[PDB]
């Protein structure tokens, strides 16, 4: 009796313990194997090139997109096997292939330098720290707080909304302070540009930074 | 349809296609063109192109 029924109890414990100890090492090896595969494909993908950047303007024909590149001009460019051309809206900004041009993908949501002007952290400036200018606060709200809140009122007057605001006067009188305080409360996306940031250097730096 | 031409002249217009500006049409089969970098090139004219610029 105690050979067939004894080995499958006194040594089955050992084989099951060994199976579990092997299982943990199998998981540990698989981690390193997936990791080394990752690193190998990492090296291999570090062998193509940037293929620069371009912007689509017209899909003149399937497989023949008109694009405009960053440094240079405009070209006719095809797309990779994904070839979802009708997904490509103009000015989407896209990633090409390096040579024979050709297109790699569509890239995520467009803007890069232009993104810098958008105000990430709104300043602490608040209307409660401006004195007297309350009338000017209302005259700025009628072009800022009213239209973004009540286009229905403009329709109920049937008139077109005002296009913009010019703050002028003596230097050091609060227009900067009002701008900062407005950044704190409009809660729409706030973007700011120094006047001297524009035109700048190299042709198009005036074109690009406005367009 | 024009698959024979698609097999010939589409290959002649081997992608990609650069874009520039013409300035001289001196030869009926060679013109002189400008491009983005501002360089100037005396280049041949392929017969399928429109006779207008």
């Amino acid at each position: 009796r105690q050979y067939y029924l004894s080995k499958i109890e006194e040594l089955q414990l050992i084989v099951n313990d060994k199976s579990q100890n092997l299982r943990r090492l199998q998981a540990q090896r698989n981690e390193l194997n997936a990791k080394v595969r990752l690193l190998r494909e990492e090296l291999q993908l570090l062998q193509e090139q940037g293929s620069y950047v371009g912007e689509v303007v017209r899909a003149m024909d399937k497989k023949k997109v008109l694009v405009k590149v960053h440094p240079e001009g405009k070209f006719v460019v095809d797309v990779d096997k994904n070839i979802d051309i009708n997904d490509v809206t103009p000015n989407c900004r896209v990633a090409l292939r390096n040579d024979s041009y050709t297109l790699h993908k569509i890239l995520p949501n467009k803007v890069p330098l232009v993104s810098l002007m958008m105000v990430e952290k709104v300043p602490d400036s608040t209307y409660e720290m401006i004195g007297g200018l309350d009338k000017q606060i209302k005259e700025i709200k009628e072009v800022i707080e009213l239209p973004v809140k009540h286009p229905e009122l403009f329709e109920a007057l049937g008139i077109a909304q005002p296009k913009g605001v010019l703050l002028y006067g003596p230097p050091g009188t609060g227009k900067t302070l009002l701008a900062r305080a407005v950044a704190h409360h409009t809660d729409c996306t706030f973007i700011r540009v120094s006047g001297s940031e524009l035109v700048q250097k190299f042709i198009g730096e005036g074109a690009r930074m406005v367009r | 349809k024009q698959e024979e031409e698609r097999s010939k002249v589409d290959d002649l217009r081997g992608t990609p296609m650069s874009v520039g500006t013409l300035e001289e049409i001196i030869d009926d089969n060679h013109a002189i063109v400008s491009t983005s970098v501002g360089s100037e090139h005396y280049v041949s004219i392929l017969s399928f192109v429109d006779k207008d610029l």
Binding site: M60, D61 | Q2, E5, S47
Partner: peptide, 24 residues
């Protein structure tokens, strides 16, 4: 249908042969 974007090109009877390919 797709729209043409002012690409030109003449009809087939007016171009190619081996002449253009050899010239290029």
């Amino acid at each position: 249908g797709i729209k043409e974007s002012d690409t030109g090109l003449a009809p087939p009877a007016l171009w190619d042969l081996a002449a253009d390919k050899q010239t290029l």
